[PDB]
Amino acid sequence: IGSDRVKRGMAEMQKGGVIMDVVNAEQARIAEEAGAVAVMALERVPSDIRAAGGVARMANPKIVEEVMNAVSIPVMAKARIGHITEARVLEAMGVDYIDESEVLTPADEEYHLRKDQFTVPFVCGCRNLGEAARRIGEGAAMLRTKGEPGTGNIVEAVRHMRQVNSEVSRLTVMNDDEIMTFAKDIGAPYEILKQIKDNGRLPVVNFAAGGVATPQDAALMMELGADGVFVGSGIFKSEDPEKFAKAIVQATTHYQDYELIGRLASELGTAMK
Amino acid sequence: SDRVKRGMAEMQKGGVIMDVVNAEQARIAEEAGAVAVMALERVPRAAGGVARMANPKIVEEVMNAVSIPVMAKARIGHITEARVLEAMGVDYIDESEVLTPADEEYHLRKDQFTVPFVCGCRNLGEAARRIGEGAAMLRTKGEPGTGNIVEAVRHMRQVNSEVSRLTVMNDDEIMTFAKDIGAPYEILKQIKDNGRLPVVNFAAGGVATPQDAALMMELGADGVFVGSGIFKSEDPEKFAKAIVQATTHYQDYELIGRLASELGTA
Amino acid sequence: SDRVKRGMAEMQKGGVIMDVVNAEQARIAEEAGAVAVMALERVPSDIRVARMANPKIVEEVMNAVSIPVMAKARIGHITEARVLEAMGVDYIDESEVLTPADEEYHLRKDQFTVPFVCGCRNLGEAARRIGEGAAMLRTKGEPGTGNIVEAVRHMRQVNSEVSRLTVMNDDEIMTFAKDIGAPYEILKQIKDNGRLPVVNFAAGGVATPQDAALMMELGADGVFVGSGIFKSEDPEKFAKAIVQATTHYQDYELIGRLASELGTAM
Amino acid sequence: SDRVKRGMAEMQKGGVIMDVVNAEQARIAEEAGAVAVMALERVPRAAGGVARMANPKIVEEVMNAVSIPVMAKARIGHITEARVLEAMGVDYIDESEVLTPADEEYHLRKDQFTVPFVCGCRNLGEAARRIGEGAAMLRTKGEPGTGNIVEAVRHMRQVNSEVSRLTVMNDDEIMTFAKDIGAPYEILKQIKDNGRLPVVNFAAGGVATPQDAALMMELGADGVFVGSGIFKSEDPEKFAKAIVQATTHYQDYELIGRLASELGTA
Amino acid sequence: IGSDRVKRGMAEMQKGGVIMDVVNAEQARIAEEAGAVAVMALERVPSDIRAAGGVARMANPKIVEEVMNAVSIPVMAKARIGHITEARVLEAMGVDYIDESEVLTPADEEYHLRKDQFTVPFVCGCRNLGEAARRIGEGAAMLRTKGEPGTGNIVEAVRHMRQVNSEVSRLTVMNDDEIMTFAKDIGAPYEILKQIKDNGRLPVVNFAAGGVATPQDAALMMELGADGVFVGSGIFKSEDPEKFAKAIVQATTHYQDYELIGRLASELGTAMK
Ligand SMILES: [Cl-]
Ligand SMILES: [Cl-]
Ligand SMILES: [Cl-]
Ligand SMILES: [Cl-]
Ligand SMILES: [Cl-]
Ligand SMILES: [Cl-]
Ligand SMILES: [Cl-]
Ligand SMILES: [Mg+2]
Ligand SMILES: [Mg+2]
Ligand SMILES: [Mg+2]
């Protein structure tokens, strides 16, 4: 169901961009006006999710369409891992992407969605080439570091991006007759690995996500080789989300303009661990 | 006589059974479209104490407020609790691990009763022993009172996987499969000749939203139990109708999406 | 070009392949009814460092018979297999019976034009060998022991997990594949094919007509035999006995008839 | 170009570098005789949270209040944080484990920068890897923010002991010394031909009293870092001058005794 | 750099050929006659060193001299690991290379020779990039797999060669700011590993050694990325050493001529474990 070309093709249009977890119209248009290339709709931002605890389910559909009605950029929404019904509901709503998101308390602790049997594209989280390849093999069209969401600490996301990238590059120059047992050893589908090698990188875009709290943070992920940046708590849990948003957008676009980043950097206190 | 008992269980297939605490709740359930109600004293309770059966005044009040079948819970292995409810004329007893067990080693001989029983399970071994004792209905154990669907998903997947694997198992391997999972070897041979369970297996344990109940039907259940999900929530009567409609129309994603418009539990 | 490699392998479905060490054993094999022969220097039994056979021994067996010839090569030994392929053998057996040359990596059999056969013991090893381009599988068994039990375990083990897979949920095959070490793509094909997309022969320990019949009863697509034939009294009758027993594995009166020789392997 | 960088580091030898939080502090430091200042947002902080680099307004304010070199900290491995400070024109960046690391496996490639770096260490292995990455300065890690000198004593003793032991090590034993301590084998051969470290190694971590700073100089340091010791204390400007004077006149025990007249930290 | 260029240059001159363990002039002539690019003087071939056991020291200098007189191809001799004066004596005899061979009883179990302070070039054993880098940093000009000498079993040489090449190739595409941690993790000199990346491969030739018993064996190591082949027990503990020799040489240089290797191989009777 669907096409890989179409799903992956669309996700690539956000390359270089910043995506913003938002909770209402106001946050949504703030996201759009500040330069976000897509929004992510949710009921409460990952910082409040770990605080509130409880069971984190998908958002009320009322919330999602109120955001879709606020913005001209693509709207993403989260669904619980394996929650077949939540994804189908979101997809019928016509969201541009669903995030099978480990930020939400799962519904299935052993099996993820068969995302190839959907038409809406899916973004899936990961921490290494084995997880990336299982999600890709399930039909994911976009990848992002799992990171450590809601902590404003970038280190975990740095670790994951570094690990996926390292394993991928190792595979791109790996002996053909060593790939099967490489795949065995990391728990990855042999043919996805064989694709990845021939493509010379991942066949989907791999964003950074979790603990981006400062412009330098975002520019750092791009320096580390991310295809783009998610950020939710870091922006709206700050003294001026409007300024923080435009700072993180410019910093991600000009991640090597070090004096623009320092200039931009003059704002105020932000999220903490 | 198992044909009678199981056959009355099947008349619930596809429906929603709701835990109810008094008569308002009882017919709020019935008005909203429930196929049955569970009479109980505290919805899943994790307050504390010892959970025994309801007072019979509470069961009787519930049977006297609706025409859809009424079930009630008894502690595991509590011979007189089950016999008392059976004399009251409930339609089903649930020998329910939601209540403090009275016997921690041996369940009731439900074949030596005339009222049909529903018992919980988590895998084919528990489902086969409860069937062998004479259960006429099965439900996942799940994780009641938590509003988290994940454990019921795990149990539905485990029961169904082992069932479906048994349906195509070599004849001469079923004995030592039965040894390995702890199951009556004849109940397993029955399950193979039937290609599914001889009883209906409902989901139960933390159904909180319309999409929850629908997910369970998508996953292969025959129906849905729901208790805390409804009344522990903002405007329950609306929650009731939505969960009933989602459980019947569980692939109508536009309908489920609309239905989802309210404010959940926790 | 995998359909053509796998299609030739099916030409032996139902037959008996025989380890022969020279022209006259190769002729005995063909006379008795072998569908193919395995050229090799020391039979699996009295093997117990083992490299490929001298090419001279191999071509002698090609020269003696008109049914296809296979020869073994050490696991992962690129130039042993390349030499064999360029001598024109019909199949190469990347065989664990020989001392492995690469303990971590097998050959990329898809990058060859001669079709390959590999051993396995479970759906995991099977899928990985198929993923590398094996065209035909055999149980690893316990070669040279005249004892069938390991081949029985391997056959039963492969067939159970295949069966489990033909009815396994779609959204579970990835976690299955991870848990058993299998290429996910191959398991989805096995499901769609309803069986393994290559033929799986029983190998290792077949010592009597009854053994060859048992393996076929158990689901195999054919039998490999080596030791139990020539390390017995009158190998020529032992061959004809086993060949007939394999094609008529449910003609039990014939097998008992046929079972009328003397001493055997181990 | 390492000669340039390290040579500007040496112009601090014998002095005191002070953590400062705004401009008053900054020139209180300079008035009292500091050789350099560390710009930071919270003096060692053990309050909590995530410690990132200072806001550039805070760094700029500090550089605009003194003429002695200004340093600032960046999280370990935070490529853009270091690049940002480098564009601001600080004199040194400290890749500082006092701040929450941004990379927990890999430190910055400091040779690919033009501003000199100071990095922490606890032994010759950490000192040799930081040097090999391009550090132009070393400081003990110690135990910052605790006012306890003991961990910096331990680290100075360990670095110096291993250095001095390396200076007289047999040529043909340095490789497997380098393996054992985790160090670049060329950096170790350099250290031997030089008879000491090629950079200056300052003490840092809980200098609270004049006798503390002097003890570090007695122990073989090239200088003293101090942050909490000064401003977290009764009348800091007096503490400042006393620690500057004790670090220069570190064997003048009558002078240190007089200087010690005030009231410490905790 | 400098006299390393010369040392390494001279070892490269045997790239593609076969070096042969010989023990007297007649064996040494067979080697040269059959096409060897070099010979290795020793007193027992690794098969007998294993069976006799005892203490295996350098060869008696007559045996070496007898061998250098008998041939015009370079002569190598073995010395115990870390035996300073065994190497110095061999150097003064004018051998062309010394093998600091772990096939001999190590005289030093903790510290190898400082090879950069000799003028004769050295070949060293290894099993992974850590050992390789440490031998290079000590001044080796040539590497070889440690294999499992005397066993006639190629599997160990295959593992060592596959590991080295895997770690090398992974290094050639490895991030600059990760080579420190990589070097630490494997026990390698950080600067040698930065070299290996720059040159895009090992800066010295790395031969296969230990267990070559048939032409197919030798050809396989060439197939695996070896720069050349050592062989000792495999020849002279076989039916016809002279025919085994030329067949090995031919098969090493034409290691993708499967028609030829097959032809060559049809003269057998070999060694085993
Ligand atoms: Cl996020
Ligand atoms: Cl009873
Ligand atoms: Cl219930
Ligand atoms: Cl066999
Ligand atoms: Cl860098
Ligand atoms: Cl400090
Ligand atoms: Cl050797
Ligand atoms: Mg900032
Ligand atoms: Mg809801
Ligand atoms: Mg004091």
Residue numbers in the entry:
A (entry chain A), E (entry chain D): 5 to 277
B (entry chain E), D (entry chain E): 7 to 50, 54 to 275
C (entry chain B): 7 to 54, 59 to 276
Copy text from the publication.
Interestingly, independent crystal structures were obtained from crystals with different space groups.
Pdx2 has glutaminase activity, converting L-glutamine into L-glutamate and an ammonia molecule. The latter is delivered to Pdx1, which synthesizes PLP using ammonia, ribose 5-phosphate (R5P), and glyceraldehyde 3-phosphate (G3P).
